Amino acid sequence: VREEIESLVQDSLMEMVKGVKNTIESDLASKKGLAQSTTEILQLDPTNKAFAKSVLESPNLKGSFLAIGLGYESDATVVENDDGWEPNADYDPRKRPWYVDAKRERKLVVTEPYVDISTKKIIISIGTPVYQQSNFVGAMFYDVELTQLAQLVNSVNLFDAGYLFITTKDGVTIAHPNAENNGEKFSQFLPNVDLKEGTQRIELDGKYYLVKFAQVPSESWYIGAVVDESIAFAMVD
Amino acid sequence: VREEIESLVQDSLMEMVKGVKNTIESDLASKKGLAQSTTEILQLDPTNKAFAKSVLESPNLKGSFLAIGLGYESDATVVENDDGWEPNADYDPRKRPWYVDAKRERKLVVTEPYVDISTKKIIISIGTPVYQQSNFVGAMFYDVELTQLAQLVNSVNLFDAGYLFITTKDGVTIAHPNAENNGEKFSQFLPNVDLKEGTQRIELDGKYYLVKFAQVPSESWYIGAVVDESIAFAMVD
Ligand code: PRO
Ligand code: PRO
Numbered sequence: 001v002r003e004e005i006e007s008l009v010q011d012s013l014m015e016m017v018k019g020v021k022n023t024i025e026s027d028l029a030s031k032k033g034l035a036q037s038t039t040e041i042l043q044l045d046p047t048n049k050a051f052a053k054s055v056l057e058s059p060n061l062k063g064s065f066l067a068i069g070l071g072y073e074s075d076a077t078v079v080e081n082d083d084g085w086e087p088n089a090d091y092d093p094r095k096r097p098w099y100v101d102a103k104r105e106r107k108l109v110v111t112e113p114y115v116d117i118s119t120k121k122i123i124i125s126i127g128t129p130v131y132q133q134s135n136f137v138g139a140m141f142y143d144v145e146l147t148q149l150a151q152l153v154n155s156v157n158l159f160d161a162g163y164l165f166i167t168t169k170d171g172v173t174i175a176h177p178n179a180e181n182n183g184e185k186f187s188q189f190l191p192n193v194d195l196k197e198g199t200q201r202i203e204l205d206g207k208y209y210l211v212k213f214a215q216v217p218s219e220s221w222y223i224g225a226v227v228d229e230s231i232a233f234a235m236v237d
Numbered sequence: 238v239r240e241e242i243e244s245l246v247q248d249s250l251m252e253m254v255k256g257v258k259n260t261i262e263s264d265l266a267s268k269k270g271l272a273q274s275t276t277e278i279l280q281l282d283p284t285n286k287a288f289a290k291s292v293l294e295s296p297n298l299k300g301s302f303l304a305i306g307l308g309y310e311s312d313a314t315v316v317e318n319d320d321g322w323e324p325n326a327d328y329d330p331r332k333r334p335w336y337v338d339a340k341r342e343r344k345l346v347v348t349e350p351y352v353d354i355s356t357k358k359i360i361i362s363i364g365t366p367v368y369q370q371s372n373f374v375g376a377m378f379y380d381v382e383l384t385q386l387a388q389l390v391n392s393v394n395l396f397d398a399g400y401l402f403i404t405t406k407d408g409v410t411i412a413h414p415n416a417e418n419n420g421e422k423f424s425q426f427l428p429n430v431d432l433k434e435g436t437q438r439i440e441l442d443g444k445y446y447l448v449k450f451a452q453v454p455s456e457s458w459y460i461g462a463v464v465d466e467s468i469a470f471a472m473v474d
């Protein structure tokens with residue numbers, strides 16, 4: 001009997017996570033498409049900054065990212081659509097992670113989590129390189145608000161038994177219902193758990209918890225789901 | 238015993254279809270985002286046709302749709318990125334369904350299936366209106382190749398027992414492993430089945446088949462899955 005309910009919880013837990021992994025991969029691919037196309041369109045006239053300014057204020061694009069901008073290699077200037085942020089003499093775009101990563105990889109990248117100079121929160125960014133006839137001209141950032149990412153992974157009913165979260169391949173937390181955890185290794189809130197695909201079962205504070213991880217292939221992110229085993233058992237009802 | 242295997246086939250069938258519905262809604266939302274942003278960017282200078290031409294040839298955008306173009310209200314001209322098609326004196330963009338629909342609705346639309354003048358296949362299109370300071374200036378099409386749509390819905394292992402397909406809310410087939418069915422009511426290949434969500438069980442040619450439909454809310458499309466019941470039973474193994 002216990003194994004009857006156990007293998008149905010396990011398998012319903014399988015459902016929700018693979019369902020979430022696909023949803024995250026889709027939204028990620030979608031944001032990457034929007035970023036790639038925006039970059040290519042800016043490359044029609046990459047040093048026409050007035051052009052780039054207008055494009056970044058177009059409403060659908062502007063509303064799809066926390067913030068978008070383009071830093072220039074030659075003059076270290078920034079064209080940017082953040083309504084509550086401007087650079088000053090302490091800011092050089094070329095020293096930033098989205099920029100350095102896009103310059104290094106010479107293609108679209110997704111950064112590690114880092115502190116946003118604007119919101120002062122941990123974020124991630126899509127970074128893209130900008131070319132003028134195969135000369136590197138600068139790079140773009142498309143910032144991703146991580147609490148919105150946490151709402152996205154927690155778009156499934158997890159029996160009301162727990163929650164989902166995301167980590168990098170090194171276990172650095174990317175999304176969590178409590179954003180304070182972003183930027184921390186996940187062992188901070190979920191100790192004695194190894195970062196590996198499959199299911200683990202551990203006790204914490206006198207209760208058992210099921211933990212499921214599923215990899216996101218394209219960025220080697222992990223989707224974590226944690227559920228109170230007892231509440232899970234109940235909430236198949 | 239039969240009801241034991243039956244309720245697991247039913248529920249695995251539940252999994253795959255809701256999994257597919259979400260995947261279709263995601264890709265649709267993604268294409269709509271790309272189309273909305275492209276239209277808005279063209280609206281920065283809507284009668285600069287040279288500008289629109291360049292944008293539509295940018296590779297990521299061009300590779301995301303079968304074909305993209307913009308027809309103009311004033312002169313009935315077409316800017317268009319189809320490498321194997323040009324209009325002639327028998328073609329007027331303003332009489333086409335993507336155009337008429339976008340003009341009618343005054344927002345982004347997804348057309349009913351219709352015959353593509355270029356490929357001579359049934360397709361669908363995202364249509365968008367183009368404005369110059371709230372005067373209607375023309376409309377855009379973003380064509381969707383339906384066999385690629387059929388590959389997308391059939392991205393799940395359906396036990397090797399059958400296949401998935403898509404219909405409009407009127408049961409007109411939008412995607413099918415055999416594209417010959419596109420544009421036909423689904424009763425052509427799947428008779429005595431009502432178009433409704435849930436599961437039906439019918440006999441055809443001396444075998445029982447399970448049929449699951451799930452609605453796609455945003456366009457009122459239906460995702461159909463058909464499986465040979467016996468093969469389904471086997472292929473949980
Ligand atoms: O932190 C950075 O470098 C970018 C630019 C402002 C918003 N995020
Ligand atoms: O059939 C039409 O009107 C559009 C334009 C060429 C491709 N599809």
Ligand SMILES: [Ca+2]
Pocket residue numbers: 080081082083084085086
């Ligand atoms: Ca600003």
Ligand SMILES: [Ca+2]
Pocket residue numbers: 317318319320321322323
């Ligand atoms: Ca052409």
